[PDB]
Antibody
């Protein structure tokens, strides 16, 4: 099985720098022209850099040329991309992909890496306030019920949210990242269970906004 | 730097029906195109290569054909899992140019939302700030309206909405209407309700709570 995985970025102050590190096995890496393709927030895919299956050939994007540097470690089956002089606009999710169009065909993108988020923000990291939201009526009378976790103030955008350690699945909706007047981001994680099962499962959301090195668990009580 | 444009963007098509999306290259790319299905989240996945040849492992539903400028990714039968933002890539030029991203929405039978109201927690009340969260859960279509009423008085120019990218298991959208209000103003009022208006709702049915009653 082909397993391309773009390792990790985050949030760097404008003009900073940050090394990205895609990684793949399940195919002989030394045979293909692996390459990076950044993706704006809502916009489309935009190929950024490309390295040959040898290492002796680098091809850059019009603007990125001279700021980001693509590298390959085909001994340790690894792909890297180091940023420098990061402009504001480069806030994208950087995917990596193998490019074998074979002899017949130029450059098709066979498999795409998970794609990590690299943000260029003037602003600084902010830990998330987790408030437990639930209703005024324990006995709703409607056998369908709902409760959540308002993940109030965070930054940058990546924040893992699930329930019951990862057991609650049927009903779990994790709302998209919402920008605020302040500038902080917010998300609400909700789950739809029965009204009867108020105390049959301890409804506990597990919040984890990895950038601020935080982890916050909350059993939605009262 | 051939610019690829996808017409249109919102392509909602009923299940089983053919969803036909386009991609018009600026230059001529001569049958050297690619198509992708980037479902919500998941990194894009190849569909058609060489602007015709369907990649192995992808169903015949996707049948791509055209050359130079006229490109059309066709889907003879549409399913719930087929709800995705689609991309076209040119490879005539050595870099590789992409299209806007045609979102396909699976047209479903209209089902009304299950509305829930969320009064703020005492931890948030300690921070001063208060948030009321109106929750509309799993309804068709995306097209719905959420209004407010703090002591009947409609709270306008303040409420932040957040909608979920359509579900796989049922083809439904769910939205949140977070309402920020400082403790000083929050305490001055008691009536709290979000008004709901939808195609399923016979009449706009609103769920409400009062500050004191809990």
């Amino acid at each position: 099985q082909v397993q391309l995985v773009e390792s990790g970025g985050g949030l760097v102050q404008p003009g900073g720098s940050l090394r990205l590190s895609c990684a793949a096995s399940g195919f002989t890496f030394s045979y293909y022209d692996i390459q990076w393709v950044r993706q704006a927030p809502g916009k489309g895919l935009e190929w950024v850099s490309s390295i040959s299956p040898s290492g002796q050939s680098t091809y850059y994007r019009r603007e990125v040329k001279g700021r980001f540097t693509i590298s390959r470690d085909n001994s340790k089956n690894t792909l890297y991309l180091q940023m420098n002089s990061l402009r504001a606009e480069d806030t994208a999710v950087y995917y990596c992909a193998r490019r074998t169009g074979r002899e017949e065909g130029g450059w098709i993108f066979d498999y795409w890496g998970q794609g990590t988020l690299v943000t260029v923000s003037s602003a600084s990291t902010k830990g998330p306030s987790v408030f437990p939201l639930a209703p005024c009526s324990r006995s709703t009378s409607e056998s369908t019920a709902a409760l959540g976790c308002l993940v109030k103030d965070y930054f940058p955008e990546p924040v893992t949210v699930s329930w019951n350690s990862g057991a609650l699945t049927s009903g779990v909706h994790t709302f998209p990242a919402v920008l605020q007047s302040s500038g902080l981001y917010s998300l609400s994680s909700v789950v739809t269970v029965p009204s009867s099962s108020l105390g049959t499962q301890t409804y506990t959301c597990n919040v984890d906004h990895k950038p601020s090195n935080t982890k916050v668990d909350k059993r939605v009580e009262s | 730097e051939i610019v690829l444009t996808q017409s249109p963007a919102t392509l909602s098509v009923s299940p089983g029906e053919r969803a036909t999306l386009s991609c018009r290259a600026s230059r001529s790319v001569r049958r050297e195109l690619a198509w992708y299905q980037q479902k919500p989240g998941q990194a894009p996945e190849l569909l058609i290569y060489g602007a015709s040849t369907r990649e192995t492992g992808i169903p015949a539903r996707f049948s791509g054909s055209g050359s130079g400028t006229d490109f059309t990714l066709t889907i003879n039968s549409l399913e719930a899992e087929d709800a995705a933002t689609y991309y076209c890539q040119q490879y005539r030029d050595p870099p590789g140019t992409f299209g806007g991203g045609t979102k396909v929405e699976i047209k479903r039978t209209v089902a009304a939302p299950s509305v829930f109201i969320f009064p703020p927690s005492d931890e948030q009340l300690k921070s001063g700030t208060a948030s009321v969260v109106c929750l509309l859960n799993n309804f068709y279509p995306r097209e719905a309206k959420v209004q407010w009423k703090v002591d009947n008085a409609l709270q306008s120019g303040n409420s932040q909405e957040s909608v979920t990218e359509q579900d796989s298991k049922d083809s439904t959208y769910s939205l949140s209407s977070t309402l920020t209000l400082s403790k000083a103003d929050y305490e001055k009022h008691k009536v709290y309700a979000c008004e709901v208006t939808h195609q399923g709702l016979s009449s706009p049915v609103t769920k409400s709570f009062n500050r004191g009653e809990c």
